[PDB]
Scaffold this active site. Structure first.
Site, PDB file in Angstrom:
ATOM      1  N   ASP A   1       0.708  -1.224   0.019  1.00 46.51           N
ATOM      2  CA  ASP A   1      -0.063  -0.025  -0.007  1.00 46.51           C
ATOM      3  C   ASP A   1       0.762   1.353  -0.122  1.00 46.51           C
ATOM      4  O   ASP A   1       1.790   1.409   0.812  1.00 46.51           O
ATOM      5  CB  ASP A   1      -0.805   0.027   1.323  1.00 46.51           C
ATOM      6  CG  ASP A   1      -1.994   0.945   1.110  1.00 46.51           C
ATOM      7  OD1 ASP A   1      -1.739   2.042   0.789  1.00 46.51           O
ATOM      8  OD2 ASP A   1      -3.217   0.355   1.242  1.00 46.51           O
TER       9      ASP A   1
ATOM     10  N   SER B   1      -7.295   4.974  -0.715  1.00 44.27           N
ATOM     11  CA  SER B   1      -6.978   3.364  -0.501  1.00 44.27           C
ATOM     12  C   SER B   1      -8.237   2.330  -0.869  1.00 44.27           C
ATOM     13  O   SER B   1      -8.279   1.387  -1.363  1.00 44.27           O
ATOM     14  CB  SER B   1      -6.519   2.592   0.698  1.00 44.27           C
ATOM     15  OG  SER B   1      -4.965   2.892   0.973  1.00 44.27           O
TER      16      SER B   1
ATOM     17  N   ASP C   1      -9.675  -2.678   7.343  1.00 40.14           N
ATOM     18  CA  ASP C   1      -8.982  -1.588   6.469  1.00 40.14           C
ATOM     19  C   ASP C   1      -9.571  -1.786   5.041  1.00 40.14           C
ATOM     20  O   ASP C   1      -9.891  -2.642   4.435  1.00 40.14           O
ATOM     21  CB  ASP C   1      -7.477  -1.602   6.657  1.00 40.14           C
ATOM     22  CG  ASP C   1      -7.110  -0.179   6.265  1.00 40.14           C
ATOM     23  OD1 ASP C   1      -7.551   0.757   6.660  1.00 40.14           O
ATOM     24  OD2 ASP C   1      -5.733  -0.190   5.936  1.00 40.14           O
TER      25      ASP C   1
ATOM     26  N   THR D   1      -8.240  -1.917   2.332  1.00 38.40           N
ATOM     27  CA  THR D   1      -7.424  -2.839   1.374  1.00 38.40           C
ATOM     28  C   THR D   1      -7.973  -4.454   1.398  1.00 38.40           C
ATOM     29  O   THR D   1      -8.385  -4.807   0.310  1.00 38.40           O
ATOM     30  CB  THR D   1      -5.893  -2.757   1.398  1.00 38.40           C
ATOM     31  OG1 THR D   1      -5.484  -1.208   0.969  1.00 38.40           O
ATOM     32  CG2 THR D   1      -5.342  -3.671  -0.073  1.00 38.40           C
TER      33      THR D   1
ATOM     34  N   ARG E   1     -15.759   3.415   4.060  1.00 42.14           N
ATOM     35  CA  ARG E   1     -14.867   2.859   4.412  1.00 42.14           C
ATOM     36  C   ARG E   1     -14.608   2.669   5.884  1.00 42.14           C
ATOM     37  O   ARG E   1     -14.187   1.871   6.455  1.00 42.14           O
ATOM     38  CB  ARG E   1     -13.639   2.959   3.829  1.00 42.14           C
ATOM     39  CG  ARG E   1     -12.864   4.418   4.253  1.00 42.14           C
ATOM     40  CD  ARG E   1     -11.712   5.106   3.528  1.00 42.14           C
ATOM     41  NE  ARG E   1     -10.343   4.882   4.276  1.00 42.14           N
ATOM     42  CZ  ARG E   1      -9.270   4.765   4.110  1.00 42.14           C
ATOM     43  NH1 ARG E   1      -8.929   4.911   2.606  1.00 42.14           N
ATOM     44  NH2 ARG E   1      -8.411   4.444   4.789  1.00 42.14           N
TER      45      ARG E   1
ATOM     46  N   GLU F   1      -1.315  -8.163   1.409  1.00 42.31           N
ATOM     47  CA  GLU F   1      -1.099  -6.971   1.641  1.00 42.31           C
ATOM     48  C   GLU F   1       0.006  -6.402   2.597  1.00 42.31           C
ATOM     49  O   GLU F   1      -0.135  -6.503   3.973  1.00 42.31           O
ATOM     50  CB  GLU F   1      -2.311  -5.847   1.759  1.00 42.31           C
ATOM     51  CG  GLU F   1      -1.952  -4.456   1.979  1.00 42.31           C
ATOM     52  CD  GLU F   1      -3.088  -3.523   2.842  1.00 42.31           C
ATOM     53  OE1 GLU F   1      -2.995  -2.440   2.804  1.00 42.31           O
ATOM     54  OE2 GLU F   1      -3.891  -4.192   3.375  1.00 42.31           O
TER      55      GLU F   1
ATOM     56  N   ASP G   1       2.383   2.341   3.276  1.00 45.20           N
ATOM     57  CA  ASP G   1       1.411   3.394   3.280  1.00 45.20           C
ATOM     58  C   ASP G   1       1.310   4.443   4.463  1.00 45.20           C
ATOM     59  O   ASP G   1       1.447   5.553   4.570  1.00 45.20           O
ATOM     60  CB  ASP G   1       0.085   2.977   2.743  1.00 45.20           C
ATOM     61  CG  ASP G   1      -0.899   4.334   2.918  1.00 45.20           C
ATOM     62  OD1 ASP G   1      -0.857   4.983   1.814  1.00 45.20           O
ATOM     63  OD2 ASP G   1      -1.559   4.356   3.921  1.00 45.20           O
ATOM     64  N   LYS G   2       0.994   3.724   5.698  1.00 46.53           N
ATOM     65  CA  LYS G   2       0.728   4.462   6.964  1.00 46.53           C
ATOM     66  C   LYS G   2       1.817   5.101   7.368  1.00 46.53           C
ATOM     67  O   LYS G   2       2.128   6.091   8.182  1.00 46.53           O
ATOM     68  CB  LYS G   2       0.121   3.390   7.841  1.00 46.53           C
ATOM     69  CG  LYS G   2      -0.997   2.745   7.315  1.00 46.53           C
ATOM     70  CD  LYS G   2      -1.635   1.510   8.412  1.00 46.53           C
ATOM     71  CE  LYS G   2      -2.703   0.610   7.896  1.00 46.53           C
ATOM     72  NZ  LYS G   2      -3.789   1.457   7.655  1.00 46.53           N
TER      73      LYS G   2
ATOM     74  N   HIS H   1       2.623   7.956   5.335  1.00 49.01           N
ATOM     75  CA  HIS H   1       1.829   9.075   5.858  1.00 49.01           C
ATOM     76  C   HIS H   1       2.291  10.022   7.067  1.00 49.01           C
ATOM     77  O   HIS H   1       2.275  11.112   7.443  1.00 49.01           O
ATOM     78  CB  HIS H   1       0.429   8.699   6.406  1.00 49.01           C
ATOM     79  CG  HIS H   1      -0.852   8.256   5.066  1.00 49.01           C
ATOM     80  ND1 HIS H   1      -1.204   9.395   4.537  1.00 49.01           N
ATOM     81  CD2 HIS H   1      -1.198   7.103   4.790  1.00 49.01           C
ATOM     82  CE1 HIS H   1      -1.905   8.898   3.674  1.00 49.01           C
ATOM     83  NE2 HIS H   1      -2.115   7.524   3.928  1.00 49.01           N
TER      84      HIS H   1
ATOM     85  N   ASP I   1      -1.509   0.438  -4.772  1.00 52.35           N
ATOM     86  CA  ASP I   1      -2.807   0.755  -4.876  1.00 52.35           C
ATOM     87  C   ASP I   1      -2.608   2.292  -5.395  1.00 52.35           C
ATOM     88  O   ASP I   1      -3.356   2.567  -6.275  1.00 52.35           O
ATOM     89  CB  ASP I   1      -3.743   0.803  -3.770  1.00 52.35           C
ATOM     90  CG  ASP I   1      -3.010   1.331  -2.580  1.00 52.35           C
ATOM     91  OD1 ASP I   1      -3.949   1.553  -1.578  1.00 52.35           O
ATOM     92  OD2 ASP I   1      -2.082   1.683  -2.394  1.00 52.35           O
ATOM     93  N   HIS I   2      -1.764   2.959  -5.051  1.00 50.32           N
ATOM     94  CA  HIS I   2      -1.448   4.487  -5.461  1.00 50.32           C
ATOM     95  C   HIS I   2       0.030   4.909  -5.022  1.00 50.32           C
ATOM     96  O   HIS I   2       0.708   4.246  -4.261  1.00 50.32           O
ATOM     97  CB  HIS I   2      -2.656   5.383  -4.948  1.00 50.32           C
ATOM     98  CG  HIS I   2      -2.550   5.136  -3.332  1.00 50.32           C
ATOM     99  ND1 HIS I   2      -1.564   5.617  -2.531  1.00 50.32           N
ATOM    100  CD2 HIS I   2      -3.346   4.365  -2.573  1.00 50.32           C
ATOM    101  CE1 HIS I   2      -1.968   5.308  -1.134  1.00 50.32           C
ATOM    102  NE2 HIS I   2      -2.993   4.515  -1.261  1.00 50.32           N
TER     103      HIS I   2
ATOM    104  N   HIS J   1      -0.838  10.741  -0.371  1.00 50.14           N
ATOM    105  CA  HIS J   1      -0.945  10.023  -1.679  1.00 50.14           C
ATOM    106  C   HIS J   1      -0.587  11.170  -2.786  1.00 50.14           C
ATOM    107  O   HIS J   1      -0.986  12.411  -2.733  1.00 50.14           O
ATOM    108  CB  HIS J   1      -2.447   9.360  -1.886  1.00 50.14           C
ATOM    109  CG  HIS J   1      -2.739   8.411  -0.793  1.00 50.14           C
ATOM    110  ND1 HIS J   1      -3.839   7.819  -1.112  1.00 50.14           N
ATOM    111  CD2 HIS J   1      -2.254   8.081   0.333  1.00 50.14           C
ATOM    112  CE1 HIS J   1      -4.097   7.032   0.210  1.00 50.14           C
ATOM    113  NE2 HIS J   1      -3.125   6.876   0.752  1.00 50.14           N
TER     114      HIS J   1
HETATM  115 MG   LIG Z   1      -3.992  -0.704   2.746  1.00 43.34          MG
HETATM  116 ZN   LIG Z   2      -3.580   2.951  -0.056  1.00 46.61          ZN
HETATM  117 ZN   LIG Z   3      -2.815   6.033   2.570  1.00 44.47          ZN
END
Ligand SMILES: [Mg+2]
Ligand SMILES: [Zn+2]
Ligand SMILES: [Zn+2]
Ligand SMILES: [Mg+2]
Ligand SMILES: [Zn+2]
Ligand SMILES: [Zn+2]
EC number: 3.1.3.1
Lengths: 449, 449
Positions: free
Chosen positions: A51, A102, A153, A155, A166, A322, A327-328, A331, A369-370, A412
């Site tokens: 992610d 996400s 989550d 994902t 979500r 995953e 990703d986290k 961030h 994912d991005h 992102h």
């Molecule tokens: Mg995820």
């Molecule tokens: Zn993501």
């Molecule tokens: Zn994110």
């Protein structure tokens, strides 16, 4: 099968300061490429998601752990490569929304339809579309869902749940946030409830916290989601040994691993990037997390166990893995946490490739994912954001920059990014594709209907 | 006859809000990729460089100009894709320097050796290494060098000049910054002087200004470099019409086109991004630059005429074409300039491919020397750097962000990035490769000893 090759060595061939010493290739690849091409059907599919793992994230992770001229034995070993687009849509207008979240991106590969940021398993009209996981089950394949984040989550939630938001983790939030999905209001239920009904053979990750919630309606009303789960035949494991105890996993006895209340813990620790941190503070060396635990399975471990159990299914299997925390940590502007979760994903990718190489009828896909915030900049860079200098494996300094948000969270970004594959139908990721194509590629390799 | 196919159309196939309408593919790609694999020798090579054109920059330009679900008929049409690394070296230590400048990266693909930032055609020990161009010339192939920048600029200069510093444009700077290279101190001379010695068949770009300096030594001492070129038999052109009138270009009558005093004018005008620009300001729509001109040839025109002229050589040709201004406008935090220069390169890429599909023995490569600053972020982003909102072809807003420098110039970034190719030997760009592998690939494709 020696049939389909994986790149064994794309590391710098020699002395990087010398002519040709930095080459990654040893000779012409045309032949190996032809040999990597097959339209035979795939028996199994293993989908690995980093992610927020764009090209910058991969490069940064490689530079740090393997050195600039190094090579990731998993991530970098997939022979067929391309770049894919993951833009979302504006709900109101149906026009592109350049930077996805996400939930929308996962919905794209899981169902083949573009959606709005925040949606899970529904289109811009709030109408449900079947996920690849549901489709595989319907077809009789074994299905697996593995992540290091909470199971609610975006994902992993995306393969088993259809909600307008979500945030609709459990009954409580759902009634508030997704009334139409609220079990009581007649909806299909909260992500967790939908997860339980989806009944994948293997589901492993965090998010135990939400299973403490109690059902507002239905057969299992008034009892907890965990009780509902045991009440439904699920096999509840909570640690590595228990997970190891596991000998079989199926529709009679689906497996449900809840290894943490929230997200599984990160592999590595380091300080958070700070304003002028590469200038004002000393280079960092990442620290392994002392509290990651021996009682907590690693992603590579969950991966291996998932493969053993699902592989028992003669018809085949679909498996999503995953590496959630890249990703986290991105961030959070935490270089060490971000890098560590990428190295962690590489191991799982190695496990997957090992199996697919032997198995022979496995399509393995590695992508994100991005894209994300992290950038690699010059050592003496003076940036308006958050920076950190790190000590890499090459014994040199690398500086990382997070300059896209003044808020407490780095954003992102919308850049197209790497997708890579090995196995039958892998040619489908070469060149430019869209994230929605991934769904049609997988559905088609398996022959689902 | 498209012996080998190019991607005719990978835009979204339908309505992007409906199931499958965002798909870029219409069926399985296996057979077509098999059809893109050839190990035959290549007669010609066309190397197209978008300076600073990483995946982010391609995405940004695509979204703006063709829409998120659009497709660049040039850029996106190459079927064999990969990601490559372009780290430089620290002169002193010989260890990797994670973020390269334009000179070191160009040196890397041009000679196959890594070097230090600022170097051209030399290694870390300041030893000269032959370039792909000098080598092709030597084998009797025609050679082309095309760019929208000053010809003294890093990218085009790397094919013909070897100097300790990229700043050594002409006699004056050379005397001061590259004393070892200075003609008067017995060196090989300034970038400009070495360009005149290299004598490629076709050289087109900007940088007429330095041609006004006088030589400090040699056979043409005291005369301007422009007079030397005339004395040496070069045909000098300086506008679209004079260039179009050229019917020949060879070692006897080499072409030298100088269309600007500095860099050629950019295609589109727009304001510079600013602090909170996506919030305190209304959306920008780029506009064509009135200074662009009809007497001023475009990159696609320069590309077309060079191919014409160079194709008359039966042994084959080597041509490098540079869309120089993407990087420059990226440093400047000027979205329209950046995007406009990206669209421009795409046009040049189309001509290249049109010729190549016809010819059938031509290798076409599209990539960048390094990554850059630009990021696509959400419309509501509150960023610490410079931002701007743009009205794209989709009728939606896109926000671009530049937050890696507090200085006047935004910075290059170290991420691995897209490399794409079409033709014989194109397979060597797939997967993970290094920027120096590109030298070896082109050498081998042309069969150079
Ligand atoms: Mg995820
Ligand atoms: Zn993501
Ligand atoms: Zn994110
Ligand atoms: Mg350049
Ligand atoms: Zn550059
Ligand atoms: Zn630059």
């Amino acid at each position: 099968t020696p049939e389909m090759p994986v790149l064994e060595n794309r590391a710098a061939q020699g002395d990087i300061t010398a002519p040709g010493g930095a080459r990654r290739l040893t000779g012409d690849q045309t032949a190996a490429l032809r040999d990597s091409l097959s339209d035979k059907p795939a028996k199994n599919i293993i989908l690995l998601i980093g992610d927020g793992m764009g090209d910058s994230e991969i490069t940064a992770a490689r530079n740090y752990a393997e050195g600039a001229g190094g090579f990731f034995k998993g991530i970098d070993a997939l022979p067929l490569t391309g770049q894919y687009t993951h833009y979302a849509l504006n709900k109101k207008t149906g026009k592109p929304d350049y930077v996805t979240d996400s939930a929308a991106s996962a919905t794209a590969w899981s169902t083949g339809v573009k959606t709005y940021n925040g949606a899970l398993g529904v289109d811009i009209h709030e109408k449900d579309h079947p996920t690849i996981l549901e489709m595989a089950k319907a077809a009789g394949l074994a299905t697996g869902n593995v992540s290091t984040a909470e199971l609610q989550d975006a994902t992993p939630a995306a393969l088993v749940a259809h909600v307008t938001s979500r945030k609709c983790y459990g009954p409580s939030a759902t009634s508030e946030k997704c009334p139409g999905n609220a079990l009581e209001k007649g909806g299909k239920g909260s992500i967790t409830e939908q997860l339980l009904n989806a009944r994948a053979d293997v589901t492993l990750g965090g998010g135990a916290k939400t299973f403490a919630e109690t059902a507002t309606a239905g057969e299992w009303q008034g009892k907890t989601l965990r009780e509902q789960a045991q009440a439904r035949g699920y096999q509840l494991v909570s640690d590595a040994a228990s997970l190891n105890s596991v000998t079989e996993a199926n529709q009679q006895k689906p497996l449900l691993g809840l290894f943490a209340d929230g997200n599984m813990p990160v592999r590595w620790l380091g300080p958070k990037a700070t304003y002028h941190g590469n200038i004002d503070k000393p280079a960092v060396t990442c620290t392994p997390n002392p509290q990651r635990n021996d009682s907590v399975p690693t992603l590579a471990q969950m991966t291996d166990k998932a493969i053993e159990l699902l592989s028992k299914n003669e018809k085949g299997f679909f498996l999503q893995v995953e590496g959630a925390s890249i990703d986290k940590q991105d961030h959070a502007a935490n270089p060490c946490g971000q890098i560590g979760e990428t190295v962690d994903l590489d191991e799982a990718v190695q496990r997957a490739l090992e199996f697919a190489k032997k198995e022979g009828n496995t399509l393995v896909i590695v992508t994100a994912d991005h894209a994300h915030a992290s950038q690699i900049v010059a050592p003496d860079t003076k940036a308006p954001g958050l920076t950190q200098a790190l000590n890499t494996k090459d014994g040199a300094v690398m500086v990382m920059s997070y300059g896209n948000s003044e808020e407490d969270s780095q954003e992102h970004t919308g850049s197209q990014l790497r997708i890579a594959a090995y196995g039958p139908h892998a040619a489908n990721v070469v060149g430019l594709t869209d994230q929605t194509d991934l769904f049609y590629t997988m559905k088609a390799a398996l022959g689902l209907k």
